[PDB]
Amino acid sequence: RGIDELWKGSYLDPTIGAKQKEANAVAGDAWPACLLRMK
Amino acid sequence: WTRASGMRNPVKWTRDWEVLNRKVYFAFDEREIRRSMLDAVSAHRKTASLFHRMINAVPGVAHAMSLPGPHTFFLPSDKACRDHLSPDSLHALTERVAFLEEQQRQRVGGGTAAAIADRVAKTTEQLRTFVLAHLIPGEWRMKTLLLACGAGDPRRNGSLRYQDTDRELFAPVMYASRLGSVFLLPPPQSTDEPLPVWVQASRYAAFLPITTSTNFPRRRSTVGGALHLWVGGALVTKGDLRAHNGVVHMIDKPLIPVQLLASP
């Protein structure tokens, strides 16, 4: 039910294609300390 | 160096089956026991209270039962005494044992006093006779007694080897297609009549084929086992209470001598 989250959407996921894997792999910047200090 | 033990014992035992059979012989028939017959009786005092009290209260009986000579003692239980002795006989036995214990306690601490000595002598002789009526020369173990009564002899063990029952009456769901020799032991030390011993098949023997692989050819007591050993009209309930100088067999009836029995 929830253990699938360890591989869902990653390159280990067997139910999705290469383009979807690449799209899921794209990522942005890490949280800066300045913005983290506001939380 | 190793700490393996139990099922991982590092001891290299022999696997030779003949040597292991010899080991069985040494471990069971030739085993050495430190305790004595009175040690066993004391261990079972709670179940054999009356005989324990008699042994400890009657002069000379303990000395006789502590001697080196290999002996066999048939110990009745308090339950056996209560069931088989008449109420008056049981009351008399209890009173006399208590009397001997009371005299012993007095030692620890006219004609009326003189009669005490005579009564003590009479009670001591009677209770000594009773207790020693169960002591038998030699060491007669349970398997020896069975083999003497003939169990284990292919020519005589009939009626004890192939017991069967009406199976469908007790395990019906498995039977849909059916739903449609007296040995003699030396006399007791206090008497001259040798003791008869025999064997019978228990009620549990017939049910063996229902639950075991068999190779057959073409009230009732609840004591366990397939064979029942009877000694002088009394059933052995617990046998092979081995000691250093003998063996104790537990029985369900006291072997009262004819002299102590009442003719009328």
Binding site: - | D16, W17, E18, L20, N21, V24
Partner: protein, 50 residues
Amino acid sequence: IVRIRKRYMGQRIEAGLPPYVWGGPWPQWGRKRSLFIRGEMYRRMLIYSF
């Protein structure tokens, strides 16, 4: 001869013929009563568990 006999018996097993054996006199190749000694040992173990 052992090889020949084994071949024949295995051939019958493969074919699915009834599980029959030669019934004649089997020679005794051992001296020890291992069957009965081991049976006695098993009896003792069962009694201990009980």
